[PDB]
Amino acid sequence: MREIVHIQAGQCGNQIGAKFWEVISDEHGIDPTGSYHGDSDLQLERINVYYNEATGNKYVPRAILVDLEPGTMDSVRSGPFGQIFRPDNFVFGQSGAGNNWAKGHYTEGAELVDSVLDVVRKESESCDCLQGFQLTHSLGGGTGSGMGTLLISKIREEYPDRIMNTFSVMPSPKVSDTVVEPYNATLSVHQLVENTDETYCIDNEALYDICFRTLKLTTPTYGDLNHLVSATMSGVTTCLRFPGQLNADLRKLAVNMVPFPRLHFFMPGFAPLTSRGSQQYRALTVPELTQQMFDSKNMMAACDPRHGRYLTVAAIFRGRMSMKEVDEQMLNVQNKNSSYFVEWIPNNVKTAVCDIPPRGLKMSATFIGNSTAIQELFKRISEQFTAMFRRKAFLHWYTGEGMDEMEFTEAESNMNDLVSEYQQYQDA
Amino acid sequence: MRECISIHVGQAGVQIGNACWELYCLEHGIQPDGQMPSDKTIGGGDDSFNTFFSETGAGKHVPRAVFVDLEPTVIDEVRTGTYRQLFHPEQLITGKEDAANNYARGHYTIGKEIIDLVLDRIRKLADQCTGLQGFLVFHSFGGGTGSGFTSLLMERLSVDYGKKSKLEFSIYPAPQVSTAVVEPYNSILTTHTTLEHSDCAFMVDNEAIYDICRRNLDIERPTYTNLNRLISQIVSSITASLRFDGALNVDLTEFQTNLVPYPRIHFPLATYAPVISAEKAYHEQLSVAEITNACFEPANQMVKCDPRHGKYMACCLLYRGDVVPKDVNAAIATIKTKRSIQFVDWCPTGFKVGINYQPPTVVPGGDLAKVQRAVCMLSNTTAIAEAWARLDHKFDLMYAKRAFVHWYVGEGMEEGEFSEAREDMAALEKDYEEVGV
Amino acid sequence: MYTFVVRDENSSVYAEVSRLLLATGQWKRLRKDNPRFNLMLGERNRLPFGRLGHEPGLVQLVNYYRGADKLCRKASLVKLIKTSPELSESCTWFPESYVIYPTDEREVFLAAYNRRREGREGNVWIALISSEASELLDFIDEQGQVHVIQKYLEKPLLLEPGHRKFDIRSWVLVDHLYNIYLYREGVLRTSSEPYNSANFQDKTCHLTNHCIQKNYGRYEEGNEMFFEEFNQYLMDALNTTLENSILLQIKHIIRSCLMCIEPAISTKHLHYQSFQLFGFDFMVDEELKVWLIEVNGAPACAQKLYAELCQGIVDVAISSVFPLATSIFIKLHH
Amino acid sequence: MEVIELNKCTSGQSFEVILKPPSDPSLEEIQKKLEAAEERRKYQEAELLKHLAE
């Protein structure tokens, strides 16, 4: 269980994906040309997880860049780290998906999908032991949403015994491109519920609110939102990328986080919350990290954890600190707030400490929670969906691409089922 | 002379295996290259250490050990480690992908594709034996390989070597050190499949070892190395009588005879004293009376439980160091009057004592101080059922909601096996209850 | 904030203890099945002692002592006194008692029954109270359960005016460090009907239990005479104090019984800790000699004394282990 | 009280001290059970590949 194949799809998928490779290449000591210029041997011990060995010691990201529009992918190639990516792994169409799920899934995306799978297959054949796949995408547009889920469905056919992992960006009227985003998201969730092992629910509502209420930025751009995304993406992958007490892989994470196969939607969280450029000079104490990471204000999904119960929790502390104090604080939170953790999964919180801190911070904490509070996110999408769907509004964009009204009704039903499934274990 | 084969399964089994073989080598004066200066019969012999070591014409002493993990990482550190020359690569078996904390994945899925290879390498060691008596099996209850594969191995060893004894060294799961949340599932599943196939099993609760390291070794946050060096001392004490001249527990069959009258109730409690920090300046050396008294303190046991609220069936005292029979009997007499020691009506109230004059060996630079005298007590008490009750309650909490069950079923297992394994455990808890009060 | 669980619904004492803890604003009650507690107010039967003291980052305490049933079950109490060297076969404060099973020490019982026949003296026993042994043995086999046959105290001390029988109840709290705390306030559970010497058939004047009495409440409210009034009666009618004539023997019996079981039940070096409230039942004869009847595992308090005793339990048994933001007990020294 | 079975040597000594007197499946069945789970796995993958083909 070594190699992970990273796929990034659509505008959002490629933009957060580029930031991910930018951040982790700095952490592993790789420059924008592919050469290792780090000082610690601990940086290279698990580099094969995300990077492919090359002649001359060059390191290349195991990354496939997918879009139906060439626009965003040219922005990556001309961007800060764009030269590092294997040029063949740039797979693009010309027309675009026009924020339409049907175009991504059924028409425009179908034309391009086999080309991506040829690049996937070529990357998979190099692998000593392929761990699985991770996708970065939004659920509100057309490519990342529609084509992204078409890829997942096709990958699961060719590799049925591998882990499927997503970083899925949830749409919000606060950071909105089109009115059809709740349609695109509901159709995507329907696919994610069936075809993924793990989904990190990154809510654009939450990322806006963190930028507005906490980071003090009055009008935040996508860059400020993606700073929060990439920092969370760094933290959740730390254990896969670095040696620790545990030999950490995607399957072990799935076995331990997912008690019931449909309930695999995770609330990410980060501490401390930082804005771009400007640095905090005071390092947080271990009690401060523990209090903040469990705080709702630090959650990447706009759900109040006090409205639900925690099924399973994974926490990761980064930096040189007392592992005894980490254990003491983690146990303190559980014993002070025992009602918010299900009694029917004993010892549902696991904690790891990595010595290497991320760029700019001396010590930090990353939170991964399978809470029943995530239902609020799915209810919000469901409410926005129904408001339009009861009048069959904007539906002609989808019926014109061959889709039936029944498929919308089915997707509405499955998501509402997921909501009631999460509600079942909140009261149990 | 009758040879013993050690099998080390999964991470816990392998790393504890490494800790033990390191200690055995220091005890018998065997160097990391395998040369033993004190050994005079070059390339042969049937001495007491030959139970655990075979020989080559060159003069190398090779362990009768097989290391097996479904994942390369851990055994790769044995292949590259300071004891690389000691083993031949055929003894060290690795897979590609691990059992992902899943009993069913280790038993059914990944178990099937490696079982025949492992038994072949075990047969390779068994053919070198003039009269093999059986197997010592090292594993964890909690891990997928440790639970799943070990139970399939125990199934097959009973078929291929029906005449031979099988002893277990098992790591009972503790939340302070645990890898996975499904460890109660794996523990119950593996015990059910292994119960008929195991003659004697020594449970080691990671919680007990952890807290001993905090209290007595002054280690703030114990690592596996801290735990394993301590576990290896206890294992060494138990195996000492097979590796040295003596008359108590000389073969593996005697472990059954001395400690196990009821075949299902084959889990002796181990207690060890004394555990003293090496970085402790000025230590008053503890006497025979003091260390024997410490064998009846719950804080020194390998599993936390209360022997006062239970009954004994057997009791072995194994001393290492400056100990004479007179001091032992004096100690026993004082302890009997001052403590609650109750035996079952169908057993003699008494102790079987073994003394080895060589003081315990500690690894140089380790956390344990050199002591003049030490003792391991092995007692078959009904009190150890507390550990089964703890584990069963955690199992019942998860299984009532059918949590995580789909991972096991997804690997080919049936939901019925969960309740079958739990019914056997419920039967075992009743067995201890009847004998108990 | 400390956390506790309630697993005894019927416990009138610990219902008041749970009430007082919440009112301090420093204790929170959890669900029965929640393992993440500091304190447990446990069930009377099948209490899961094996599950306690296995929660990292929690000091755990329970309101029962594992093994205390030896003192609290009638059959075991007889066995403990007869076998324990500390107590001795010859115990001055314990009535001659024998353990009898239904279809055992029947031959030892009958041989002692002959001594009262050879000397021709008081040969009355308690199980119902009967004079002949051949009528008592039929009752034990008729019920099914194991019963204790005990020498009945034919000549007890009787309160005036009324010629009334009584028993003394003492409340004792053993803490986590095995300090033995006797509560300064005891109670006399009194008979209302005059004591009958020849007629053992009538059960109201012979048995002094609060439930059986409910003549009721004639001399004192709810047939309960407290420690201030009883001391005064002894001062006037007998020229002695309660402290001298009765209480020194009581302190001797309590201390003797609990010192005996200390090595078997102590939680000094255990992973979990225990306290317990005990109810000791005593009997005073005409010559002012105190006899032990039974020990109670889950005793009920007298109504007047609930407020003070339950605060006492919190003060020395609970808050000593879990400190917050004069004494009502007498410590029995050992 | 009674010290019996005393055996001595250079390495050490052993003895008993008495204080008070008293008052399998076959190779065929394993291969069958293992294959029965392999069949149940293959049925689950087939029902997955059937659903995906739809």
Ligand SMILES: Nc1nc2c(ncn2[C@@H]2O[C@H](COP(=O)(O)OP(=O)(O)OP(=O)(O)O)[C@@H](O)[C@H]2O)c(=O)[nH]1
């Ligand atoms: N005492 C001790 N316990 C260990 C050690 N390694 C793992 N454990 C414990 O064993 C349990 C996990 O089992 P592992 O042996 O790691 O799993 P495995 O057998 O490698 O199987 P996989 O699931 O395939 O990884 C947990 O309870 C750990 O705390 C060790 O070196 N010493």
Ligand SMILES: Nc1ncnc2c1ncn2[C@@H]1O[C@H](COP(=O)(O)OP(=O)(O)CP(=O)(O)O)[C@@H](O)[C@H]1O
């Ligand atoms: N040996 C004896 N001699 C004289 N009176 C006795 C006696 N044994 C019992 N009694 C009387 O019978 C009554 C019942 O006591 P006993 O202990 O047998 O029942 P019990 O268990 O219901 C007491 P409690 O209600 O406190 O639990 C006592 O109040 C006492 O006065």
Ligand SMILES: Nc1nc2c(ncn2[C@@H]2O[C@H](COP(=O)(O)OP(=O)(O)O)[C@@H](O)[C@H]2O)c(=O)[nH]1
């Ligand atoms: N957080 C974040 N969200 C984005 C970004 N770009 C687009 N989005 C969101 O994604 C949705 C539109 O998807 P997009 O990726 O542009 O469409 P696609 O190119 O067809 O996949 C909207 O809900 C936007 O709010 C980005 O860079 N960061």
Ligand SMILES: COc1ccc(/C=C/C(=O)c2ccc(OC)c3c2OC(C)(C)C=C3)cc1
């Ligand atoms: C108590 O519940 C648990 C929850 C999760 C685990 C995970 C074990 C892992 O192997 C693993 C894999 C990937 C990871 O990065 C996302 C992590 C990870 O686990 C740690 C604790 C090391 C932290 C993160 C076990 C139990």
Ligand SMILES: [Ca+2]
């Ligand atoms: Ca030799």
Ligand SMILES: [Mg+2]
């Ligand atoms: Mg867009």
Ligand SMILES: [Mg+2]
């Ligand atoms: Mg492993």
